[PDB]
Design an enzyme around this catalytic site. Structure first.
Site, mmCIF file in Angstrom:
data_model
loop_
_atom_site.group_PDB
_atom_site.id
_atom_site.type_symbol
_atom_site.label_atom_id
_atom_site.label_comp_id
_atom_site.label_asym_id
_atom_site.label_seq_id
_atom_site.Cartn_x
_atom_site.Cartn_y
_atom_site.Cartn_z
ATOM 1 N N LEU A 155 -3.551 38.139 -15.590
ATOM 2 C CA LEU A 155 -3.416 37.489 -15.808
ATOM 3 C C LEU A 155 -4.081 37.370 -17.640
ATOM 4 C CD1 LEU A 155 -4.267 34.655 -13.235
ATOM 5 C CD2 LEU A 155 -1.925 35.337 -14.282
ATOM 6 N N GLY A 156 -4.956 38.372 -16.934
ATOM 7 C CA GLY A 156 -5.871 38.362 -18.633
ATOM 8 C C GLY A 156 -7.505 39.535 -18.468
ATOM 9 N N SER A 157 -8.730 38.992 -18.626
ATOM 10 C CA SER A 157 -8.931 40.187 -18.942
ATOM 11 C C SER A 157 -10.067 39.982 -19.632
ATOM 12 C CB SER A 157 -9.011 41.608 -19.777
ATOM 13 O OG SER A 157 -8.836 41.897 -20.294
ATOM 14 N N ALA A 211 -14.564 40.494 -20.234
ATOM 15 C CA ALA A 211 -16.222 41.591 -20.346
ATOM 16 C C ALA A 211 -16.395 42.157 -18.441
ATOM 17 C CB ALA A 211 -17.727 40.963 -21.119
ATOM 18 N N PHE A 212 -16.309 41.381 -17.954
ATOM 19 C CA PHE A 212 -17.033 41.721 -16.537
ATOM 20 C C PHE A 212 -15.894 42.318 -15.599
ATOM 21 C CE2 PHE A 212 -21.379 40.743 -15.566
ATOM 22 C CZ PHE A 212 -21.275 40.296 -16.478
ATOM 23 N N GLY A 213 -14.351 42.050 -16.222
ATOM 24 C CA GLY A 213 -13.221 42.443 -15.105
ATOM 25 C C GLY A 213 -11.635 41.719 -15.437
ATOM 26 N N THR A 214 -10.935 41.990 -15.034
ATOM 27 C CA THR A 214 -9.410 41.475 -14.753
ATOM 28 C C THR A 214 -9.415 40.828 -13.958
ATOM 29 O OG1 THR A 214 -9.444 43.617 -15.469
ATOM 30 C CG2 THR A 214 -7.593 42.781 -15.211
ATOM 31 N N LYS A 267 -10.347 38.377 -9.085
ATOM 32 C CA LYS A 267 -11.458 39.082 -10.405
ATOM 33 C C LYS A 267 -11.553 40.558 -9.750
ATOM 34 C CE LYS A 267 -13.225 37.944 -14.082
ATOM 35 N NZ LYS A 267 -14.882 36.244 -14.517
ATOM 36 N N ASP A 304 -22.772 31.858 -20.284
ATOM 37 C CA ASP A 304 -21.238 32.876 -21.274
ATOM 38 C C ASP A 304 -20.346 31.009 -21.238
ATOM 39 O OD1 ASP A 304 -19.280 34.374 -22.041
ATOM 40 O OD2 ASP A 304 -18.506 34.698 -20.365
ATOM 41 N N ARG A 342 -12.371 29.174 -22.703
ATOM 42 C CA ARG A 342 -12.278 30.432 -21.766
ATOM 43 C C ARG A 342 -12.973 30.544 -20.671
ATOM 44 N NH1 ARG A 342 -15.500 33.315 -25.520
ATOM 45 N NH2 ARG A 342 -17.633 33.774 -24.439
ATOM 46 N N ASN A 343 -14.133 29.490 -20.524
ATOM 47 C CA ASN A 343 -14.911 30.296 -19.353
ATOM 48 C C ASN A 343 -14.312 28.219 -18.322
ATOM 49 O OD1 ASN A 343 -15.296 32.180 -18.144
ATOM 50 N ND2 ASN A 343 -16.989 32.054 -19.093
ATOM 51 N N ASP A 399 -17.720 30.879 -13.940
ATOM 52 C CA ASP A 399 -17.603 31.906 -14.001
ATOM 53 C C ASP A 399 -19.223 31.590 -14.961
ATOM 54 O OD1 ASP A 399 -15.427 33.439 -13.403
ATOM 55 O OD2 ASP A 399 -14.903 33.873 -16.065
HETATM 56 C C1 YFA Z 1 -27.076 46.121 -12.193
HETATM 57 N N1 YFA Z 1 -25.361 45.918 -11.917
HETATM 58 C C2 YFA Z 1 -24.191 45.820 -13.075
HETATM 59 C C3 YFA Z 1 -23.713 45.473 -12.524
HETATM 60 C C4 YFA Z 1 -23.608 43.546 -11.206
HETATM 61 C C5 YFA Z 1 -22.853 42.835 -11.546
HETATM 62 C C6 YFA Z 1 -24.219 41.685 -10.629
HETATM 63 C C7 YFA Z 1 -23.126 40.607 -10.086
HETATM 64 C C8 YFA Z 1 -22.225 40.141 -10.516
HETATM 65 C C9 YFA Z 1 -21.489 38.921 -9.385
HETATM 66 C C10 YFA Z 1 -21.189 38.411 -8.387
HETATM 67 C C11 YFA Z 1 -20.745 37.088 -7.982
HETATM 68 C C12 YFA Z 1 -19.804 36.884 -8.719
HETATM 69 N N2 YFA Z 1 -19.107 35.469 -8.121
HETATM 70 C C13 YFA Z 1 -18.900 35.321 -9.067
HETATM 71 N N3 YFA Z 1 -17.488 34.990 -9.691
HETATM 72 C C14 YFA Z 1 -16.526 34.553 -11.379
HETATM 73 C C15 YFA Z 1 -15.493 35.078 -10.310
HETATM 74 O O1 YFA Z 1 -15.318 35.680 -9.945
HETATM 75 N N4 YFA Z 1 -14.125 34.316 -11.575
HETATM 76 C C16 YFA Z 1 -13.270 34.596 -11.327
HETATM 77 N N5 YFA Z 1 -12.053 34.301 -11.682
HETATM 78 C C17 YFA Z 1 -10.677 34.788 -11.136
HETATM 79 C C18 YFA Z 1 -11.026 35.156 -9.792
HETATM 80 S S1 YFA Z 1 -12.364 35.421 -9.052
HETATM 81 C C19 YFA Z 1 -17.213 32.900 -10.499
HETATM 82 C C20 YFA Z 1 -16.321 32.157 -10.142
HETATM 83 C C21 YFA Z 1 -16.354 30.276 -9.479
HETATM 84 C C22 YFA Z 1 -17.542 30.088 -9.843
HETATM 85 C C23 YFA Z 1 -18.442 30.776 -10.424
HETATM 86 C C24 YFA Z 1 -18.153 32.414 -11.182
HETATM 87 C C25 YFA Z 1 -18.524 36.703 -10.682
HETATM 88 O O2 YFA Z 1 -17.926 36.814 -11.859
HETATM 89 C C26 YFA Z 1 -19.280 36.728 -9.732
HETATM 90 C C27 YFA Z 1 -20.055 38.208 -10.310
HETATM 91 F F1 YFA Z 1 -19.837 38.696 -11.458
HETATM 92 C C28 YFA Z 1 -21.162 41.093 -10.465
HETATM 93 C C29 YFA Z 1 -22.084 42.347 -10.979
HETATM 94 C C30 YFA Z 1 -24.258 44.730 -10.384
HETATM 95 C C31 YFA Z 1 -24.817 45.905 -10.521
HETATM 96 N N1 ANP Z 2 -8.952 31.233 -11.283
HETATM 97 C C1 ANP Z 2 -8.030 31.749 -12.645
HETATM 98 N N2 ANP Z 2 -7.421 30.667 -12.787
HETATM 99 C C2 ANP Z 2 -6.312 30.960 -13.639
HETATM 100 N N3 ANP Z 2 -6.843 31.970 -15.026
HETATM 101 C C3 ANP Z 2 -8.051 32.098 -14.549
HETATM 102 C C4 ANP Z 2 -8.431 32.535 -13.658
HETATM 103 N N4 ANP Z 2 -10.237 32.501 -13.682
HETATM 104 C C5 ANP Z 2 -9.822 33.088 -15.087
HETATM 105 N N5 ANP Z 2 -8.446 32.687 -15.597
HETATM 106 C C6 ANP Z 2 -7.956 33.609 -16.486
HETATM 107 O O1 ANP Z 2 -7.792 35.205 -16.465
HETATM 108 C C7 ANP Z 2 -8.865 35.544 -17.622
HETATM 109 C C8 ANP Z 2 -9.260 36.690 -18.111
HETATM 110 O O2 ANP Z 2 -10.045 35.694 -17.407
HETATM 111 P P1 ANP Z 2 -12.375 35.925 -17.178
HETATM 112 O O3 ANP Z 2 -11.997 37.608 -17.222
HETATM 113 O O4 ANP Z 2 -13.397 35.823 -17.131
HETATM 114 O O5 ANP Z 2 -12.846 36.310 -18.507
HETATM 115 P P2 ANP Z 2 -12.530 35.388 -20.903
HETATM 116 O O6 ANP Z 2 -13.671 34.738 -19.414
HETATM 117 O O7 ANP Z 2 -11.660 34.841 -20.629
HETATM 118 N N6 ANP Z 2 -14.077 36.287 -21.021
HETATM 119 P P3 ANP Z 2 -15.664 36.477 -20.472
HETATM 120 O O8 ANP Z 2 -16.050 35.678 -20.901
HETATM 121 O O9 ANP Z 2 -15.716 37.921 -22.000
HETATM 122 O O10 ANP Z 2 -15.578 36.998 -19.962
HETATM 123 C C9 ANP Z 2 -8.214 34.449 -19.116
HETATM 124 O O11 ANP Z 2 -6.864 33.635 -19.639
HETATM 125 C C10 ANP Z 2 -8.938 33.260 -17.955
HETATM 126 O O12 ANP Z 2 -8.276 31.934 -18.555
HETATM 127 MG MG MG Z 3 -14.431 33.746 -17.362
#
Ligand code: YFA
Ligand code: ANP
Ligand code: MG
Length: 292
Positions: free
Chosen positions: A19-21, A23-26, A46, A138, A142-143, A156
Site C-alpha cells: 500500500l505504501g511506505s 519513515a518506520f516501515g511499509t 505494517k 506525527d 497522512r496519519n 500511527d
Molecule cells: C529504540 N529502538 C529503535 C526503534 C524502536 C521502536 C519502538 C516501538 C515501535 C512500535 C510499537 C508499537 C506500535 N503500535 C502501533 N503502531 C501503529 C501501526 O501499527 N500502524 C499500522 N498501519 C498499518 C498496519 S499497522 C499504530 C496503529 C494504530 C494506532 C496507533 C498506532 C506502531 O507503529 C507501533 C510501533 F511503531 C517501533 C519501533 C525499538 C527499538
Molecule cells: N490501516 C490502513 N489501511 C489502509 N491504508 C493504510 C493503513 N495504514 C496506513 N495506510 C497507508 O499506507 C501508506 C503508508 O503509511 P505509513 O507507512 O504509516 O506512512 P505515512 O504515515 O504515510 N508516512 P510517515 O508518517 O512518515 O510514517 C499510506 O498511503 C497510508 O495511507
Molecule cells: Mg502512517
C-alpha cells in the site's frame, strides 16, 4: 487488557499487496486466515524497516499493548502483532486510504460540510489521545485514515523527521507535548483546506526553523475565511501555552460546521454532495458499524 492485542503466528496471515511506505516501515494489504476456516479476511500490515532483537521487541510490545487499548470512534486501534525478525503490526484495512490522498483525488468535489466535519473529528481524536496521556508526535493528513468519507480516524500515534509539521520547540529542543501536537493539528487542517498541498513547498527543511522564528506562517488557504485562518494561526503561536486546546478546537469547528458556507468559500459548494441520511446508513451497514 492484554486480550486486546492478538499475537499472530506467521502461518495465519499473508501479505498480498504493497500500500505504501513511511519513515518506520511499509504498509501492505494482507489477509488473515483464521485457523480451521476457509475465509480470508483483509487486514493492513505494517512491517518495520529495521529488524530488531528480542530486547527491543520488549519495548515494541510494551507500546503495542497501549495502542491496542484505545477505544474512541476517531482513533484507530492496533489489533495484532507478529514478532518476526522484522516486526509486523496488524490493524484494520481502510479501503479509502488516508485523508491526504482522499482530498488530493477529490480536490474538485469536496464541499465545506465534509472539510469542517473532518476537522471536528480529528480534533475529537486528538482530544481523546490527550485524555489518555498519549502524544501523537506525527500528526499529519497522512496519519488520518478515511473509514468512510463521512468518518475519519487518527492513526500511527505513540508514546515517547517531519520538520514541516513540527512545532518550533520540537525542531529546536526535542520538546514534544500536547501543545506541540496542536501545532501539527494546525498544519493538518491547512493540508485539508488546500486539498492536500505540500506545506512550505520548495523551502528546504534546513531553513524552516529560521523562517518560523522570523514570523512567517503557512499562507491563508484560498477557500478559508479569516475566521478559520485565525484558528490555524493560533495553533502556530510560538508560546506553546497560547495555542488552543483540543477541547476548544472541537467547539470552534462544531460551531462552524453548523453553517459551513459562512466559513469556507468553495466554488460549487451548493451542488456538492452533502452527507445524506440514506447514504450514511448504507455506508455504516457495509463498512462502519461502530457506535460513533
Ligand atoms: C529504540 N529502538 C529503535 C526503534 C524502536 C521502536 C519502538 C516501538 C515501535 C512500535 C510499537 C508499537 C506500535 N503500535 C502501533 N503502531 C501503529 C501501526 O501499527 N500502524 C499500522 N498501519 C498499518 C498496519 S499497522 C499504530 C496503529 C494504530 C494506532 C496507533 C498506532 C506502531 O507503529 C507501533 C510501533 F511503531 C517501533 C519501533 C525499538 C527499538
Ligand atoms: N490501516 C490502513 N489501511 C489502509 N491504508 C493504510 C493503513 N495504514 C496506513 N495506510 C497507508 O499506507 C501508506 C503508508 O503509511 P505509513 O507507512 O504509516 O506512512 P505515512 O504515515 O504515510 N508516512 P510517515 O508518517 O512518515 O510514517 C499510506 O498511503 C497510508 O495511507
Ligand atoms: Mg502512517
Amino acid at each position: 487488557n492484554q486480550a486486546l492485542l492478538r499475537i499472530l503466528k506467521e502461518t495465519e496471515f499473508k501479505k498480498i499487496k504493497v500500500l505504501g511506505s513511511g519513515a518506520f516501515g511499509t504498509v501492505y494489504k494482507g489477509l488473515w486466515i483464521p485457523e480451521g476456516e476457509k475465509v480470508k479476511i483483509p487486514v493492513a500490515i505494517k512491517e518495520l524497516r529495521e529488524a530488531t532483537s528480542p530486547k527491543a521487541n520488549k519495548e515494541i510490545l510494551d507500546e503495542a499493548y497501549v495502542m491496542a487499548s484505545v477505544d474512541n470512534p476517531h482513533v484507530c486501534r492496533l489489533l495484532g502483532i507478529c514478532l518476526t525478525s522484522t516486526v509486523q503490526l496488524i490493524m484494520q484495512l481502510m479501503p479509502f486510504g488516508c485523508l491526504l490522498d482522499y482530498v488530493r483525488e477529490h480536490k474538485d468535489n469536496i464541499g465545506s460540510q465534509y472539510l469542517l466535519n473532518w476537522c471536528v473529528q480529528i480534533a475529537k481524536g486528538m482530544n481523546y489521545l490527550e485524555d489518555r496521556r498519549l502524544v501523537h508526535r506525527d500528526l499529519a493528513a497522512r496519519n488520518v485514515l478515511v473509514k468512510t468519507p463521512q468518518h475519519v480516524k487518527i492513526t500511527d500515534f505513540g508514546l515517547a523527521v517531519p520538520i514541516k509539521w513540527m512545532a518550533l520547540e520540537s525542531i529546536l529542543h526535542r520538546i514534544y507535548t500536547h501543545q506541540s501536537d496542536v501545532w501539527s493539528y494546525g498544519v493538518t487542517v491547512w493540508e485539508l483546506m488546500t486539498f492536500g498541498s505540500k506545506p512550505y513547498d520548495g523551502i528546504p527543511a534546513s531553513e524552516i526553523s529560521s523562517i518560523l522564528e522570523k514570523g512567517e506562517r503557512l499562507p491563508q488557504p484560498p477557500i478559508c475565511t479569516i475566521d478559520v485562518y485565525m484558528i490555524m494561526r493560533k495553533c502556530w503561536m510560538i508560546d506553546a501555552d497560547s495555542r488552543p486546546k483540543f477541547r476548544e478546537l472541537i467547539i470552534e469547528f462544531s460551531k462552524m460546521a453548523r453553517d459551513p458556507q459562512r466559513y469556507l468559500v468553495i466554488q460549487g459548494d451548493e451542488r456538492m454532495h452533502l452527507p445524506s441520511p440514506t447514504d450514511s446508513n448504507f455506508y455504516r451497514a457495509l463498512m462502519d458499524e461502530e457506535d460513533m
